[PDB]
Design a binder for these strands. Structure first.
Ligand SMILES: [Mg+2]
Lengths: 105, 681
DNA sequence: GCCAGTGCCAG
DNA sequence: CTGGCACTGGCCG
């Protein structure tokens, strides 16, 4: 259920999509990114109704991250109607993520 | 004999005031201090020593004290003062000859800590005096609540400056006697502090006289400077900068930017176990932050959102965005391997080698990235030219003086072998005419860029070089074994084709490549093999050239015994000791030193002959030495007629040098007349 | 600011 | 082989 973005599909899959979209900017060499990975898989299932979860590997797709001023990973950007609604950086826990989504959905 | 030193308000180029001077006279065994109003008396005392046919000792006096006194005497007293070369001794020149195996700070111009090996103590102190004085001055000011300014310690005379002046002479005298105690250069039977100048030069080893003559002449050369075309280089800089930018544009398009961990202060530990993971990038664990703000209402007392982006406890990896830098070997390596490149050779530190040779052999699938490698090689070369000519700390454009000339420094005996070293900037490393942009670089250095002080007409350049000096030096040394056979071949027939046959080589060019490398103690890249055929090439060469094998053996038996040495030095042509760093480089040391001393005596004799013919050395005269690059000299001449005379005189001087040291191989020179270094190659 | 590491330019 | 010096990248106050 997780959408794997690319620099070329980002605009249409995220910016011009409907509903809430949670984007995770990550890299294979980051410890925290690997921590939150499993959590994101479970979040995609739960909010399978009112939320779409997408991932963008910054090494394979170097063009997008710079546009949002990434300063650390994992960076979670919540998009709504083509714009960043909320943003949180770090390996949030299952519960913490839940609260973040609930409070912003 | 007297020992002296002066303190003035600036470096030679801009000195305007004599602050003080100190003189130690060996005849009275007393020190005498001269304050600012005693300048005239200071000069009279030096001239009195000259009138006695005496000697004046300075530390670095050839380049500073002597020339500064001439300048200051004219500016302050409207007096003509010119100490003769024969009456002056320089302990820095002596130290560089006797302790040639050691480095020195070049009077504080170089950082002590960056130099390899040990440093002679007295010389170290003399070279650090300015820095110490500045430190004493500074703390004395700050203790008085006064702010220090750039270099105010030299604006006015003061008593602590006088004290440093006295100390300099005390140490210079100590250095002098330490140097004079070396019996290899100074016969013990003679007290060199109690003899006239003629005895001093004639009774000391020949090398002592040659080194002082070389330093006197080269100080003059530095003063002359090399006329430089500033405008042409500024235009070259614009051209190079434009190509650099375009290459960067292309390369940054081909190789995109990426993220790298940076700023991590915490070790990443396994959430499950807890075992540290040093390999993973360092992380950061925010201590503050949450989803909601800490509340302010009954509804919430049982909530406002925290717009901040961090959550206490939730670790992340700090990263920085990096753009491709074509000058970074690390980026180059990173991008090329990602393209499929597989390194074959690394450095002793593990990093893969990224030099022109390996880059040329790199093969990747993507044609754009493959072609980008040429852009990288070109970018690296362009950067090298830009750094040397305009942006580097020692760039030509930063060194050109008001007189439109570059006054590079020369250490007359900076190399262990007796060769000179050049710096600030190094005028012995200007790109050759055959390398990219070499013609423009070379053309910017030339006599044509100096307009005569009277007529306004550009001067002309005479470029003279010693012909195949290294090989002729080899022929000389093998003569006791082949009776001049190699020498006869050099000037009658072809020595390179002769070596080609000797070392079973395919192309004559391979011979020239083989010889000039065999002397450097070197491999098979000449033919295309390596570390296998090479061994066979040496044995075959030495087998068909028995005289060179004999020479090598004789050298060895003289230095080594098993490394356990019997003597770690070779006697140079003028009798000096030449330190041998390694047994394998012994022959190269012998040959390079021979060429160096030959060229040193050659430029000295050439100028003396020009002077005896009536020509005046200087821009206010007939000719001016502008550069000495090991086996060649570039001389500015007021007219073409003079240039022809300089060229012809240089040939006569070389023949005189060969005869002087009974060389077993005839020595020659070749000269060219033109407007600049590009033409006079 | 410095110290290493690497590489290239001259002869 | 003998030298000078430019750049990058890590550490530092
Ligand atoms: Mg002095």
């Amino acid at each position: 259920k997780i959408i794997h973005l690319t620099d070329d599909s980002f605009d249409t899959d995220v910016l011009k999509a409907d509903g809430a979209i949670l984007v995770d900017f990550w890299a294979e060499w980051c410890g925290p990114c690997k921590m939150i990975a499993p959590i994101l898989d479970e979040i995609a299932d739960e909010y399978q109704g009112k939320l779409t979860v997408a991932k963008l590997n910054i090494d394979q797709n170097p063009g997008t991250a710079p546009k949002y001023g990434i300063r650390g990973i994992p960076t979670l950007l919540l998009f709504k109607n083509g714009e960043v609604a909320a943003t949180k950086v770090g390996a949030l826990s299952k519960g913490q993520l839940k609260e973040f989504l609930d409070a912003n959905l | 004999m007297i020992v002296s030193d002066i303190e003035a308000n600036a470096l030679l180029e801009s000195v305007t005031k004599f602050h003080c001077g100190v003189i130690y006279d060996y005849s009275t065994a007393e020190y005498v201090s001269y304050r600012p109003s005693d300048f005239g008396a200071y000069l009279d005392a030096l001239e009195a020593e000259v009138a006695r046919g005496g000697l004046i000792v300075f530390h670095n006096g050839h380049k500073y004290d002597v020339p500064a006194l001439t300048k200051l005497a004219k500016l302050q007293l409207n007096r003509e003062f010119h100490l003769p070369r024969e009456n002056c001794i320089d302990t820095l020149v002596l130290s560089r000859l006797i302790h040639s195996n050691l480095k020195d700070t070049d009077m504080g111009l170089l950082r002590s800590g960056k130099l390899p090996g040990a440093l002679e103590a007295w010389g170290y102190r003399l070279g650090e005096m300015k820095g110490e004085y500045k430190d004493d001055f500074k703390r004395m000011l700050e203790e008085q609540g006064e702010e220090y300014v750039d270099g105010m310690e030299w604006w006015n005379f003061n008593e602590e400056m006088m004290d440093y002046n006295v100390q300099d002479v005390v140490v210079t005298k100590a250095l002098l006697e330490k140097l004079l105690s070396d019996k290899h250069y100074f016969p013990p039977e003679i007290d060199f502090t109690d003899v006239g100048y003629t005895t001093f030069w004639s009774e000391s080893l020949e090398a002592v006289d040659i080194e002082h003559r070389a330093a006197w002449l080269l100080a003059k050369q530095e003063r002359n400077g090399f006329p430089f075309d500033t405008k042409a280089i500024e235009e070259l800089y614009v051209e190079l900068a434009a190509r650099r930018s375009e290459l960067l544009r292309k390369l940054t398009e081909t190789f995109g930017s990426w993220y790298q961990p940076k700023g991590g202060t915490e070790m990443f530990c396994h959430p499950r176990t807890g075992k540290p993971l040093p390999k993973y990038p360092r992380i950061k664990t925010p201590k503050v932050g949450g989803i909601f703000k800490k509340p302010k209402a009954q509804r919430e007392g049982r909530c406002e959102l925290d717009t901040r982006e961090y959550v206490a406890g939730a670790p992340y990896t700090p990263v920085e965005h990096v753009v491709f830098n074509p000058s970074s070997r690390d980026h180059i390596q990173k991008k090329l391997q990602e393209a499929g490149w597989v390194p074959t050779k690394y450095t002793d530190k593990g990093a893969p080698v990224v030099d022109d040779e390996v880059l040329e052999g790199v093969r990747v699938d993507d044609p754009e990235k493959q072609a980008a490698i040429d852009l990288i090689k070109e970018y690296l070369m362009i950067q090298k030219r830009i750094g040397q000519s305009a942006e580097g700390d020692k760039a030509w454009l930063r060194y050109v003086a008001e007189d439109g000339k570059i006054h590079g420094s020369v250490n007359p005996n900076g190399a262990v072998t007796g060769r000179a070293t050049h710096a600030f900037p190094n005028l012995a490393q200007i790109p050759g005419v055959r390398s990219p942009y070499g013609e423009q670089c070379r053309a910017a250095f030339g006599a044509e860029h100096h307009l005569d002080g009277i007529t306004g007409k550009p001067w002309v350049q005479a470029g003279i070089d010693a012909s195949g000096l290294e090989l002729r030096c080899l022929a000389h040394f093998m003569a006791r074994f082949d009776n001049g056979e190699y020498a006869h071949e050099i000037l009658n027939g072809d020595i390179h084709t002769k070596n080609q046959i000797a070392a079973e080589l395919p192309t004559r060019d391979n011979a020239k490549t083989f010889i000039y490398g065999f002397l450097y103690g070197a491999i098979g890249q000449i033919v295309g093999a390596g570390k296998e055929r090479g061994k066979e090439l040496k044995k075959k060469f030495l087998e068909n050239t028995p005289a060179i094998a004999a020479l090598r053996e004789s050298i060895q038996q003289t230095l080594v015994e098993s490394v356990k040495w019997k003597r770690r030095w070779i006697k140079g042509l003028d009798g000096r000791k030449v330190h041998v760093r390694s047994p394998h480089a012994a022959l190269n040391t012998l040959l390079q030193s021979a060429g160096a001393l030959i060229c040193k005596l050659w430029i000295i004799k050439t100028e003396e002959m020009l002077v005896e013919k009536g020509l005046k050395h200087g821009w206010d005269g007939d000719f001016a030495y502008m550069a000495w690059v090991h086996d060649e000299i570039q001389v500015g001449c007021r007219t073409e007629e003079i240039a022809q005379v300089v060229i012809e005189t240089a040939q006569e001087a070389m023949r005189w040098v060969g005869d002087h040291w009974n060389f077993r191989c005839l020595l020659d020179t070749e000269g060219k007349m033109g407007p600049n270094w590009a033409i006079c190659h």
